[PDB]
Amino acid sequence: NHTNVKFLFDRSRLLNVIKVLEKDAVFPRPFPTQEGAQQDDGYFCLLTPRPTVASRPATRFGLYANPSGSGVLANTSLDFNFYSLACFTYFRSDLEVTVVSLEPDLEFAVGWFPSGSEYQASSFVYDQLHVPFHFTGRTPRAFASKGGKVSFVLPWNSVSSVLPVRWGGASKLSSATRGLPAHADWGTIYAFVPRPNEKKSTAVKHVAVYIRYKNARAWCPSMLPFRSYK
Amino acid sequence: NHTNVKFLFDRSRLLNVIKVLEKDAVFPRPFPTQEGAQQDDGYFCLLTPRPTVASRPATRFGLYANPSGSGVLANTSLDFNFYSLACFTYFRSDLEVTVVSLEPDLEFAVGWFPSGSEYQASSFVYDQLHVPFHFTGRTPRAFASKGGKVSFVLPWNSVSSVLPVRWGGASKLSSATRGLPAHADWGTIYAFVPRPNEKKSTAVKHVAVYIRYKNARAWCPSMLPFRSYK
Amino acid sequence: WYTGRLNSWTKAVKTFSFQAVPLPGAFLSRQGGLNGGAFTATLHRHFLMKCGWQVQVQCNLTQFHQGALLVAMVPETTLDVKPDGKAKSLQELNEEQWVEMSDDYRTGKNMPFQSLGTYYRPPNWTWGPNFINPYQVTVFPHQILNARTSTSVDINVPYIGETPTQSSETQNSWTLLVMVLVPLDYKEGATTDPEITFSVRPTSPYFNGLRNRYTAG
Amino acid sequence: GPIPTAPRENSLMFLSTLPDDTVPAYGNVRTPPVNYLPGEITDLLQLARIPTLMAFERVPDTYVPYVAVPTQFDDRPLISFPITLSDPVYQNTLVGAISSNFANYRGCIQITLTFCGPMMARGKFLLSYSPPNGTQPQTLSEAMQCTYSIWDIGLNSSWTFVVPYISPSDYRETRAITNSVYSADGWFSLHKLTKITLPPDCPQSPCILFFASAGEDYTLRLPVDCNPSYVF
Amino acid sequence: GPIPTAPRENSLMFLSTLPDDTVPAYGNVRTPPVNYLPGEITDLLQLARIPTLMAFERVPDTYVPYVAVPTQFDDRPLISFPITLSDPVYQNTLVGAISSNFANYRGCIQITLTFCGPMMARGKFLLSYSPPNGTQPQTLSEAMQCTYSIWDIGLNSSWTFVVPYISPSDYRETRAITNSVYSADGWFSLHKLTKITLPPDCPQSPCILFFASAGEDYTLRLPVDCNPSYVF
């Protein structure tokens, strides 16, 4: 029974590593983007097996094999395991998320919103203490003790009927890039510390992400990636 | 079914941040208040979505957009989410309370009393150690280990049949301000450390508050706040 | 029934080379000298469409000919565009005459993408999800074209799509391609460089909406 | 037997939307019955159905919930707008406000119009809807090709109009961060069909009003947290 | 009564393949029905059954999925290879790719061949399989002792061939870190039986192709994690 798609696609795998928020911060802005902006990177990540760049959907995958240069570097990701696993033009399943710290004896919470929405900015001031509004909202916020462990299951949250593995259409009449999907994701995830911005610290914190597919289904078989004869 | 008021009003949201008690302390006194009093602020908070100032009911909302000045600043709060959510002249529901620390590895307990009562003052002396009486009483006192987490549900505790969202009457025959309700709250909450006052420390501690509505109902629809065209 | 002319086979064509006809997109450019005349314009006055397809091929070899051609229906392909992100021109078609294999297509490397801008460093592109696997093409609905027995092509693919229906000017979920399995060879005197002709038929369409003729953005 | 302690994977956590209840604190309470209050509410659809009045910025900071038919004539529509809830025109309607607190919607949109003018004046009007295309239609000729209806001035005073629900999905984006097929759905417009009649000594410049309401199949989804900007 | 707390031996742990579920987060959701999509997939065997084309490095970086019958004659087989999925020849077949993601396999292997040449030419071919031994057989005489079959050129154009499943175990190693009995299973070869006929004025050098597919009893086991080398 090992060949069953359900029995195959029911295990956790790492996705990406992200830093820990310490302020409201500005969300990344679409491309092309000019210099001088205050948008910060490496704090927000989108839930999607397909390639992405700088927390946004993408078509071509890249890597920084050349370290030297000038400018701002970017994040990238792609589910090597999922893509190599099998062939399916279409796919749908519930996405399960789990997070574990990568620093000694740390405590924090996590925040999420589904597709179509966007990060909530701005901050309040309580008794001379500034706190971003993202602490409270309509959507779940999770809390864990020191050490840390977070787990829950998100339901399907995209308008499209299924998730296209290799799509070839366009999304809009003008300037739309061919083949770039629209909402093939489960939303965005982010982490933050329940402390006022006034007590920000210089040392950076980093955290990994693991995901798991539940109740997977597929359609319209396809091809598999080529491997060299070198 | 998402449109159902019950399915909507069943999630936790932040309310306010307060300091941690270290002594008996004097309760705030009604307005107008003259200088030289020993009443201290930022320790007691009332459970109410409607606007409040200095831990007391209020009519007009204010904010300290101008930091500079002289005198004593005040606390304020209003459930942005609840007010923007919908329209209902009347409302009633059980109020659920939850508290989490905002400092590293802290332990404490919480204390509460319902409407109509007031803070119990004065302190005893045991074997040359002074302890406020608020430690013991007729009403619940909660205890948690280090790190901290507090949760419980309070039943409805006000004489009025429901909670008026936008009221326009008066409470008393003489000097009563029009539209200011009387007991639209679930009581007052406060936090303290189980240590003698003799061992007070200078460093301040701060704690947040989260609330959640259970089994909500409404009547007599109303209007919604205006938004500018700027 | 719409008919179109493709480029003519020549022995100079290498192996794994190909050309494709993305339906219904090719209609806009009247690819291969094809003019439906009714559906082509009817699409303009509507926005949403949902129909099937039915294709055919022809190529006449002779007793003293040999070769092998691969024809298949590959969905969700995006090979009908230049690497920049612009579809090829008629001059470019007449020039190339064929799509030659390249590591770029093997890896999905040079498929269209958005430039990052001045804020970012230049990333090194390595791979993409629209790669081409030359050998495993046979998996999809397909047929062979052998000079000794190549008669014609026939296929009937049911409708597919991320949604029950899509916009006409953008939708592309089915595509026809031809591949040269064995390079053509023959003794001189018989039919030289036979032509390749294609036919297309939609089935059970349902045009949606109503508006004036679509206007360029 | 002893506690067969099976440790839980991720206990000792706080979660915002945990459905289960908690421990009671001060049970054994009694409450005053509230059956005497009428006008109970069940779902926001009750308020969403009741119509309200839209508005437009004054023609060259005062938005106007009415439009007056001009004496001048042109082939372009007199008033039109895209059907997109993020537009300012809906930015104060009850339907728009409620929709602003959800990820997506589903169903038809209902529009109503009203006339306010003289006694012995008559005229004709044409209502039309146009799905999205390269650009908004301009000429009444181009609009006529699209779906349209005839509204006579004198037959009735409110020729109700409903935009059919058309989209290549099951829902649509309530807010449009970037223009997309699932977000915008073209535009709607009104055209003056023929010159109206000006009777003796009656005032001029009649007045017309428009109202919007959610259709019977209107439905929202995926609640979110509000923007607190209105406090400012 | 009070919680008869029975502490668990190793709770407060995170495990990759824990089968049980977790707490729902945003329940009470509805989805668009997807019954309209045809071509549903159940197991990878569906793709594993469909045949595909192998290839070989060009005879003295271009692998070739075809072989042409030469005019020269020798007793050695014209094309042969070991039956080992790790070999390059299978390194792009669907069966090979799928097998590369498992510890072990089980079942028979199916092979198909096709001819592409002139009209008035005929010939004979011999197919054979040889279990492992000291070294691969070379002469058609030696091969003839092993299992073999006769494929006529003219009777049909694809004389399907299947290698029987033989091994001293229940499975075999999908990949061979070191040569072992359970890993390799000898070789398979094809021999030209007799000189083919060259008719008047027909072209020369006919073309032959080979295809591979998993047998009806083919089965994998013990999934593993992939090699991500293909990204480079």
Swiss-Prot record, chains A, B:
Compartments where found: Virion; Host cytoplasm
Membrane-spanning segments: none
Annotated segments matching region Interaction with host receptor ANTXR1: 60-71
Origin superkingdom: Viruses
Main function: Forms an icosahedral capsid of pseudo T=3 symmetry with capsid proteins VP2 and VP3. Together they form an icosahedral capsid composed of 60 copies of each VP1, VP2, and VP3, with a diameter of approximately 325 Angstroms. VP4 lies on the inner surface of the protein shell formed by VP1, VP2 and VP3. All the three latter proteins contain a beta-sheet structure called beta-barrel jelly roll. VP1 is situated at the 12 fivefold axes, whereas VP2 and VP3 are located at the quasi-sixfold axes. Binds the host receptor ANTXR1 for attachment and uncoating (entry).
Subunit structure: Interacts with host entry receptor ANTRX1.
Protein name (database record): Capsid protein VP1
Curated annotation (Swiss-Prot), chains D, E:
Transmembrane portions of the chain: none
Highest taxon, organism lineage: Viruses
Compartment annotation: Virion; Host cytoplasm
Subunit and partners: Interacts with host entry receptor ANTRX1.
Described purpose of this protein according to its UniProt entry: Forms an icosahedral capsid of pseudo T=3 symmetry with capsid proteins VP2 and VP3. Together they form an icosahedral capsid composed of 60 copies of each VP1, VP2, and VP3, with a diameter of approximately 270 Angstroms. VP4 lies on the inner surface of the protein shell formed by VP1, VP2 and VP3. All the three latter proteins contain a beta-sheet structure called beta-barrel jelly roll. VP1 is situated at the 12 fivefold axes, whereas VP2 and VP3 are located at the quasi-sixfold axes. Vp3 also seems to be involved in the binding to host receptor ANTXR1 for attachment and uncoating (entry).
The name this protein goes by in its record: Capsid protein VP3
First-to-last residue of the parent protein present: 435 to 672 of 2181
